[PDB]
Design a protein around this ligand. Structure first.
Ligand code: ALD
Ligand code: ALD
Ligand code: MG
Ligand code: MG
Lengths: 300, 300
């Protein structure tokens, strides 16, 4: 028992709107007086192979865009384009605009996605940005424009917007500055993700969660250097561990009295010998979707 | 890739309040003009071995209870007791009281828990009521009074309130009529859960999800009777499958064109031979925390 938890979605549930442009609808985000959404809303199905987005944007009028906030309609009074993100200026400021940052996350960092169908919040989940900058979500038709966020104290920290999805549940998308995570473009050509590696610092975090929760069977007497851990790690498609990642594990290392390079030696043996049919926090697999901070904020 | 998703927590986030009674605080739920919470709020630490809850309730005055809705204080004007649930009548009706039912769920049914610390929403997760009527949640100090719910169209369907928790993440609690799920009492004596069995109809649902998402490797040519499935099921600590459960799998059986007793024969072989180190929706384990309806509403 150790729950993967999403942030309560109340504050983002406010900010969600349905954006339409021809027979293409998806979700938008409404902060102060600007409705943010994927720019591919302005495409026909015919013209998604290689859209000239500026030429497509030029042929649209402020009144081409049907923004709905409920069963209510909204008044568009300025279309703009930042990178792969359509910023629609609108009439009526969002009363519900919480304190917020637009933030960019690094691979391995976690966030909550409010999954929405046609402007209507449907479900919330916690994920990590994979090292190849894809999201293993659910493949849901109509979920383009759904956003990822962290809630830091008062402040809704928006980090992600869904642009493209595969039947494998594999999503790609942008920050709210409209720049893709990873080597992705918003056109329908063949596109390779990098090799998807296991997020080593998150597995270590989750072995610290396992300890804090009274699972000690995997703790060995032994120890390792960062370099000799990384020799093994890379044999098993684990990200190399960095001194910066060793540092953010510090607080869990102190709480449990298990030095980071001791937990690394624990992880090395699990990799080199496997689980032996045995179980950690009732998982068959080593889990990499908890950050050190995810464990700290939950394990206190 | 297939996301376990919680309901968006907006509507429940409204209804959450901090209840205090001496040096004991936990969470309450505020629907119309009644603040519902665990009755053990009225106990001292000393008197939790076998509290006489009526005698404890009698010695308290309407003004003994500190109900807070934010940094705001609330005015209590009538304490009552339904079963293990304290119903506090208060001044100020909840503006945010959504459409709601108080509902009782059966074992194996799923719901969202809004986890709260001291009246403050902290996190949301999707779980199933285990067959032994416990919840594998996170062990979080201050999470007593957190509620489970399903959101059915307009209607927040409240089904669960957390009363007691173990370091194993194993929670027990009541419906909002204050009756425990399972053989549990709200006093600190030794208490055994039943044997925790695997929720067969949910595993079948999730094999139908796996098919709908293009994982076919486990589909065998063969078929079985409900009785001969149940012979095997009970060997592997699976709940017996009922004709009623065979019925609620019908819609997934139609969507995929795989008859329920064919998917049962698929499940039998996975039980009798194991996974062979192989993977279903990228899980080592057969998963039992999706209902048939969980799959339908998500797989369309
Ligand atoms: C939601 O994100 C929406 C889902 C569709 C099923 C409607 N996505 C798009 O509309 C998006 C339009 C732009 C970004 C091209 N297209 C995709 O997300 C596309 C969906 C498939 C199922 C049609 N994703 C995709 O396949 O990646 C591009 C690609 C094309 C050809 C071969 C490999 C990869
Ligand atoms: C939240 O639910 C809160 C958590 C505590 C850690 C504060 N629960 C209670 O206060 C509750 C009070 C009533 C229901 C007795 N007590 C428990 O939930 C208790 C927590 C332990 C960690 C003290 N749960 C428990 O242990 O079950 C009862 C028990 C007692 C002795 C032996 C086995 C089982
Ligand atoms: Mg786009
Ligand atoms: Mg109680």
């Amino acid at each position: 028992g150790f729950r993967k938890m999403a942030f309560p979605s109340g504050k983002v549930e406010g900010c969600m709107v349905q954006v339409t442009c021809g027979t293409t609808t998806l979700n938008g985000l409404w902060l102060d007086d600007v409705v943010y959404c994927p720019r591919h809303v302005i495409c026909t199905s015919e013209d998604m192979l290689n859209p000239n987005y500026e030429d497509l944007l030029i042929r649209k009028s402020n009144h081409n865009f049907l923004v709905q906030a409920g069963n209510v309609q909204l008044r568009v009074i300025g279309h703009s384009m930042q990178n792969c993100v359509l910023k629609l200026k609108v009439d009526t400021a969002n009363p519900k605009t919480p304190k917020y940052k637009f933030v960019r996350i690094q691979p391995g960092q976690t966030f909550s996605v409010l999954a929405c169908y046609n402007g209507s919040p449907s479900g919330v989940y916690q994920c990590a940005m994979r090292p190849n900058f894809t999201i293993k979500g659910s493949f849901l038709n109509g979920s383009c424009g759904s956003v990822g966020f962290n809630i830091d104290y008062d402040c809704v920290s928006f980090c992600y917007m869904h642009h493209m999805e595969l039947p494998t549940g594999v999503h790609a998308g942008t920050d709210l500055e409209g720049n893709f995570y990873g080597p992705f473009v918003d056109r329908q050509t063949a596109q390779a993700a990098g090799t998807d590696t296991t997020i080593t610092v998150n597995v270590l975090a989750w072995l610290y969660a396992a300890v804090i929760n009274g699972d000690r069977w995997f703790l060995n007497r032994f120890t390792t250097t960062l370099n000799d851990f990384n020799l093994v790690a890379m044999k098993y498609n684990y990200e190399p561990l960095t001194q910066d990642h060793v540092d953010i594990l510090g607080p869990l290392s102190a709480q449990t009295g298990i030095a980071v390079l001791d937990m690394c030696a624990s992880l090395k043996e699990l990799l080199q010998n496997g689980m032996n049919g045995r179980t950690i926090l009732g998982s068959a697999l080593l889990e990499d979707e908890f950050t050190p901070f995810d464990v700290v904020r939950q394990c206190s």
